[PDB]
Each structure stands twice: as C-alpha cells, then as structure tokens.
Amino acid sequence: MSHHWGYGKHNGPEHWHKDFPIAKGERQSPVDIDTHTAKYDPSLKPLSVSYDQATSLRILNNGHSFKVNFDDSQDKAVLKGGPLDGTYRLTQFHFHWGSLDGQGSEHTVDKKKYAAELHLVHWNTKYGDASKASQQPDGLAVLGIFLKVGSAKPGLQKVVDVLDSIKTKGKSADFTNFDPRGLLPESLDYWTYPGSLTTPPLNETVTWIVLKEPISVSSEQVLKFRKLNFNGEGEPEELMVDNWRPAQPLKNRQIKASFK
Numbered sequence: 001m002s003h004h005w006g007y008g009k010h011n012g013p014e015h016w017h018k019d020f021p022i023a024k025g026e027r028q029s030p031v032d033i034d035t036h037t038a039k040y041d042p043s044l045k046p047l048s049v050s051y052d053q054a055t056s057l058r059i060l061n062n063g064h065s066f067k068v069n070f071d072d073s074q075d076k077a078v079l080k081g082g083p084l085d086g087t088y089r090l091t092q093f094h095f096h097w098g099s100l101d102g103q104g105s106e107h108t109v110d111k112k113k114y115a116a117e118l119h120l121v122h123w124n125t126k127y128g129d130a131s132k133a134s135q136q137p138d139g140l141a142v143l144g145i146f147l148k149v150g151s152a153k154p155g156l157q158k159v160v161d162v163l164d165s166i167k168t169k170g171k172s173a174d175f176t177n178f179d180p181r182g183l184l185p186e187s188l189d190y191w192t193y194p195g196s197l198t199t200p201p202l203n204e205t206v207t208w209i210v211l212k213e214p215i216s217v218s219s220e221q222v223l224k225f226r227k228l229n230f231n232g233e234g235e236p237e238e239l240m241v242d243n244w245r246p247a248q249p250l251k252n253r254q255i256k257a258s259f260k
C-alpha cells in the first residue's frame with residue numbers, strides 16, 4: 001500500500017529499510033560473486049531451461065523497469081535441476097541497467113559491474129500460485145544473466161523495438177510470440193546462492209541462479225533502454241536509468257559454482 005520507493009537519492013536503496021525492514025536481513029540480494037571463494041559443487045544436478053512452449057503476453061513499464069509477462073496457468077516454460085527441487089514456472093522477465101556502460105547490473109563478479117542484468121522470474125509450482133510461492137523460502141527462482149556492450153543480440157531486438165510504445169509508467173503493449181530463448185548465452189554454467197527479491201518487498205524467498213557467461217548486446221540496444229521514463233505521461237521527464245540495487249552483505253552464505 002502507498003509505495004513511494006524508487007532509485008533516486010531521496011527514495012533509493014539506502015531508504016528502503018524504513019518501509020521494508022528485511023532490507024537489512026541475513027539473505028539479501030544482489031551480492032558480489034567472489035569467483036575465488038565460490039566452490040564447485042559436484043552435487044548440483046544438471047540445469048534444465050525448458051522454454052520451447054513459452055507464451056509471452058504483454059510488455060509493461062511499471063515505473064521501476066519494463067517487464068514481459070508469460071502465461072503461467074500451466075507448465076509451459078519451466079526451470080528445473082541445478083540447485084532446484086521440483087518445477088519452477090516462468091512468469092515474467094525484466095531488466096536492470098545503468099546510465100553508462102560500466103554500471104547497471106545488480107550482481108557483480110569480483111566487483112565488476114556489467115551494463116545491465118536480465119532477471120527471468122520463476123515460481124515453485126508446489127505452492128500453486130506465484131503469490132503463495134513468493135512467501136516461501138524455496139518459492140522463487142530467478143535466472144540472472146549479465147549484459148555486456150559489444151555485438152548486437154538478435155533475440156533482444158524485438159524488445160528494443162517496442163520500448164518507444166511504453167515510454168512512461170503505466171503503459172503496456174501486446175508482446176505475444178516472443179521467444180525468451182533468444183536472451184540466453186551459449187553456456188548454462190552458473191553460480192547459485194539463497195537470496196531475496198532485489199526490489200521491495202525484498203522477500204527472502206529466491207534461489208538465485210546467475211549465469212557465468214554474459215550476453216553481448218549493442219550500444220544501440222542498451223541506449224534504447226535508457227530512453228524509458230520513470231515518470232507517467234504528462235509528468236516531468238526522469239530517465240529510467242540506474243534502476244539497480246547495489247551488492248548487499250553475503251553474511252552466512254556460500255555461493256556454489258556449477259563448473260570447475
């Protein structure tokens with residue numbers, strides 16, 4: 001009720017704890033991934049990203065990011081294996097990005113920030129709906145993918161080309177027949193750890209799976225992200241940039257690697 005959090009000096013991550021006290025919890029995300037500390041875990045099962053029957057629906061500017069939602073009324077696009085027990089259904093993806101190419105990711109790798117980070121958000125079907133799942137310690141799984149600026153990502157272009165139609169907060173557009181497989185890198189090598197949502201309400205209910213291999217996107221593609229607005233239509237223009245939470249304390253957690 002009456003959410004006024006954001007990313008600016010006056011409502012940004014340093015303020016969130018006053019309305020969402022779990023912001024100072026033991027299981028917060030994102031984190032810095034120390035690649036030297038992370039240990040290879042031979043017990044991790046193979047990771048299964050099964051998106052061939054994904055049904056995208058709409059794309060929306062929610063004033064924080066832009067989000068593509070999926071039909072998750074049946075097992076159509078699911079994530080299994082790796083650190084996960086059972087089946088997690090894809091519900092939405094969104095991005096976090098920066099004002100400059102050297103910042104924008106939420107996770108960091110040996111303190112390196114990437115230009116942006118893609119989050120593919122899934123819920124554990126044992127809890128029946130995403131609302132219930134969002135409140136369970138093993139309820140959600142987010143697949144995080146770094147974006148670096150270099151060559152264009154062809155599977156991103158359809159996203160880039162619709163953003164002019166959802167410039168301001170509250171705008172949505174049809175976004176059917178989008179294949180999220182076009183957003184993945186070649187390798188599914190990953191790091192995993194238990195964490196949280198990276199925006200309010202910051203629930204500590206996420207298994208994070210962060211792919212090691214970034215995707216390359218073009219400077220032109222990420223420039224289009226930076227033309228979005230945080231504000232609504234006929235409010236003063238504030239560019240939607242730097243919509244990322246910085247790294248939070250690791251506390252008593254181990255980051256596991258799927259690879260040697």
Ligand SMILES: NS(=O)(=O)c1ccc(CN(Cc2cccc(OCC(=O)O)c2)S(=O)(=O)c2cccnc2)cc1
Pocket residue numbers: 003004005006008010011012015016017018019020
């Ligand atoms: N959840 S939280 O703990 O992080 C939290 C909750 C409330 C606030 C307070 N703000 C009041 C306000 C009142 C009317 C509209 C608002 O939003 C506008 C906008 O989106 O910019 C914000 S504020 O300091 O006036 C403000 C205005 C504009 C930009 N940053 C901050 C700060 C932090």
Ligand SMILES: NS(=O)(=O)c1ccc(CN(Cc2cccc(OCC(=O)O)c2)S(=O)(=O)c2cccnc2)cc1
Pocket residue numbers: 091119121123130131132134140142196197198199200201
């Ligand atoms: N950056 S991140 O990847 O860590 C991330 C991912 C997802 C979210 C959104 N929440 C969780 C959620 C994930 C999917 C579906 C959900 O619907 C049920 C619900 O209302 O909880 C919930 S949420 O704040 O609970 C929410 C969702 C939709 C509308 N309003 C609230 C925030 C941050």
Ligand SMILES: [Zn+2]
Pocket residue numbers: 094095096119198
């Ligand atoms: Zn996110």
